[PDB]
Design a protein around this ligand. Structure first.
Ligand SMILES: *[C@@H]1O[C@H](CO)[C@@H](O[C@@H]2O[C@H](CO)[C@@H](O)[C@H](O)[C@H]2NC(C)=O)[C@H](O)[C@H]1NC(C)=O
Ligand code: NAG
Ligand code: MAN
Ligand code: MAN
Ligand code: MAN
Ligand code: MAN
Ligand code: MAN
Ligand code: MAN
Ligand code: MAN
Ligand code: MAN
Length: 599
């Protein structure tokens, strides 16, 4: 049963999610405190970086969990994530610097919390919005528990930079959440709108300046309306671009679930999950995958299918994604929640096709909780939503691991292993199924659309946050649900650890980088026995060499990189030797050591 899968997968998903959080997660061990790896995959693909988006989506989930039941272990991680942003905001990077806010649009960073210097689809203007939303989430908790001073001193300067960025740069093109399309993107705009609304509210509570945010927000909402295609009944996910796609993209479904607020009911203006526009869009998006994936062969209309990002996708050949398939279920669980709470379901001309696929012959109208129609709809939609979970479940391996994708024909996992966002997406979908909803972000007025739109923006001011520490033991006030600290799943302690040496060093044609060191596996300082690294991930402006050696757990190793020429001549990097103690920690079987050539 679905219930069986949920009960089994939940502790695995939570464990695997937290394994990807530094400095102590089992697959992110030795990364910076508060860093989140997108995936431990370092080769084909190389996802061993911290993205602003993935990190913020993951921590929003954790903050929501933590808000439901206090967990001092989660609190520790949340605090470290927040303080890591102090370092990141200050960075000058290829998108720009903090001075004019432009640097905040940078999509990804090295896990040492240094800039990523390679070519990339930058900027991505959703990042600051999503980060603000996460930090505002935690701020709400602190305020409710009488720690408002901590918000003002530690969190608000960080949040204020991100909010100023949104208010200044929302009306500018950039890359979408898939990092491919330079334009105006639904997910980005909608989250920018939410960030400004929550920001204005938090500012008012703190007695800080928020009027810029509240005056810009309605204009962002105004622009969001332009993504709707009335003739097709779906959202064109990217506009102001010439990419030549239909625009039918799980982008829009993710948008609905990440800006869900049940207090907004079935508001179509903000694209709520039970809104007629969101329901119509869901059907159009799902339908775009029904006929194209081998895994969907033989599944009838009215039944759940595996879905991907967008039908035109050619990334790894274009496949279903776990997070996309879970997102469809989540939107439906969100819809069911609101229908049950309000005791009423409205079918309109816009959502009719969606409903008739599930309840043949139903017509437009309003059906109350006493009607047989209400019960019929609830059951049909619940079954369909569970169907998306069960479809994804067919392709989850016995160990419960979630990669990024599963093959469109065979269902075998592919691309990045242990994608942090895949685990978050399972956790959120299943929370909504159980009727666990996140804190509200809007009031009724946050849905009122202006008469005429303009690209109104405000030039902001940016300053480096300086506070990098939280007061100890910020426990909940009496009466708040409270529990014991999180403990990871148990494993054996390994005797051997795969150590991936990950070295940035600019080299010229015919040169090879090797690692030499005192351990037998490293060649006991012999240059002939040194371990050659690979240039598989090498680029001139991101000169990465990589390779993996098994070392004895607990061993203290000393090493240096060498550059070996065509002629066999050896160049040692400058002193001192690197000194590394190989971890001997239960569950830590592979680590990445991120080095830069010592000049
Ligand atoms: C900046 O904001 C303006 C105002 O919302 C956007 O202008 C609209 O663009 C859409 C799509 O091209 C048109 O359908 C509307 O007619 C435009 N309205 C006006 C008043 O010009 C503009 O697209 C935004 N640009 C970016 C990059 O965000
Ligand atoms: C390492 O090599 C040196 C030669 O420089 C030698 O003295 C020593 O015996 C070697 N150690 C091991 C572990 O074999
Ligand atoms: C963040 O950094 C500051 C110094 O800039 C420390 O005071 C603090 O304890 C934390 O390490
Ligand atoms: C504050 O107090 C808590 C106990 O509630 C400790 O666990 C913590 O180390 C800090 O001293
Ligand atoms: C949480 O509990 C701690 C005790 O560890 C108090 O210090 C704090 O005021 C809050 O009630
Ligand atoms: C709430 O209560 C739990 C145990 O009941 C503690 O573990 C937690 O630190 C908080 O005080
Ligand atoms: C293997 O050994 C380590 C010792 O550091 C333990 O921490 C672990 O629980 C396992 O027994
Ligand atoms: C790493 O650091 C240690 C410090 O004990 C040195 O002994 C070693 O040579 C390397 O620099
Ligand atoms: C790794 O950690 C061990 C234990 O602290 C040290 O002995 C070694 O020098 C390295 O720092
Ligand atoms: C080392 O091995 C463990 C299982 O033994 C994995 O969980 C880990 O990802 C690494 O490959």
């Amino acid at each position: 049963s679905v219930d069986d899968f949920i009960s089994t997968e939940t502790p695995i998903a939570l464990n695997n999610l937290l394994c990807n959080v530094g400095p102590d997660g089992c697959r992110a061990f030795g990364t910076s405190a508060g860093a989140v790896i997108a995936s431990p995959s370092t080769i084909d693909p190389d996802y061993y970086y911290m993205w602003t988006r993935d990190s913020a989506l993951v921590f929003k989930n954790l903050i929501d969990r933590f808000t439901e039941t206090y967990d001092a272990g989660l609190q520790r991680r949340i605090e470290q994530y927040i303080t890591a942003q102090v370092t990141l905001q200050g960075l000058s990077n290829p998108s720009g610097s903090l001075a004019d806010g432009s640097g905040l649009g940078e999509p990804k960073f090295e896990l040492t919390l240094k800039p990523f210097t390679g070519n990339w689809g930058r900027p991505q203007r959703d990042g600051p919005a999503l980060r603000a939303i996460a930090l505002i989430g935690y701020s709400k908790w602190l305020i409710n528990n009488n720690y408002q001073s901590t918000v003002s001193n530690v969190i608000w300067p960080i949040v204020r930079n991100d909010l100023n960025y949104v208010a200044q740069y929302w009306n500018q093109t950039g890359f979408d959440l898939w990092e491919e399309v330079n334009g105006s993107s639904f997910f980005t705009v909608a989250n920018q709108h939410r960030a400004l609304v929550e920001g204005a509210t938090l500012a008012a509570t703190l007695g800080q300046s928020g009027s810029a945010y509240s005056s810009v927000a309605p204009q962002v909402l105004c622009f969001l309306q332009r993504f709707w295609v009335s003739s097709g009944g779906y959202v064109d996910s990217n506009i102001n671009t010439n990419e030549g796609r239909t625009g039918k993209d799980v982008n829009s479904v993710l948008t609905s679930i990440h800006t869900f607020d049940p207090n907004l009911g079935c508001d179509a203006g903000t694209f709520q999950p039970c809104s007629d526009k969101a329901l119509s869009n869901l059907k159009v998006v799902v339908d775009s995958f029904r006929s194209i994936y081998g895994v969907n062969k033989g599944i009838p209309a009215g039944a759940a299918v595996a879905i991907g990002r967008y039908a035109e996708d050619v990334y790894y050949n274009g496949n279903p994604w776990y997070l996309a398939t879970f997102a469809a279920a989540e939107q439906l669980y969100d819809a069911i929640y609101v229908w049950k709470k309000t005791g009423s379901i409205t079918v309109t001309a816009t959502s009719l096709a969606f409903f008739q696929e599930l309840v043949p012959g139903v017509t437009a109208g309003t059906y109350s909780s006493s009607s047989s129609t209400f019960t019929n709809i609830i059951n049909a939609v619940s079954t369909y939503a569970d169907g998306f979970l069960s479809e994804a479940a067919k392709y989850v391996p016995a160990d419960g691991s979630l990669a990024e994708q599963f093959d469109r024909n065979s269902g075998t996992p592919l691309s990045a292993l242990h994608l942090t966002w895949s685990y978050a997406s399972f956790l959120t979908a299943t929370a909504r199924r159980a009727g666990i909803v996140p804190p509200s972000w809007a009031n009724s007025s946050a849905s009122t659309i202006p008469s005429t739109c303009s690209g109104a923006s405000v030039v902001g001011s940016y300053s480096r946050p300086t506070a990098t520490s939280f007061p100890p033991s910020q426990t909940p006030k009496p009466g708040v649900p409270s529990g014991t600290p999180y403990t990871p799943l148990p494993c054996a302690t390994p005797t051997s650890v795969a150590v991936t040496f990950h070295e940035l060093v600019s080299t010229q044609f015919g040169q090879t980088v090797k690692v030499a060191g005192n351990a037998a596996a490293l060649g006991n300082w012999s240059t002939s026995a040194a371990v050659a690294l690979d240039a598989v991930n090498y680029a001139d402006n991101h000169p990465l060499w990589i390779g993996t050696v098994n070392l004895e757990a607990g061993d203290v190793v000393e090493y240096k990189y060498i550059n070996v020429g065509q002629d066999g001549s050896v160049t040692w990097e400058s002193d001192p030797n690197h000194t590394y103690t190989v971890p001997a920690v239960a569950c830590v079987t592979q680590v990445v050591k991120e080095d830069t050539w010592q000049s």
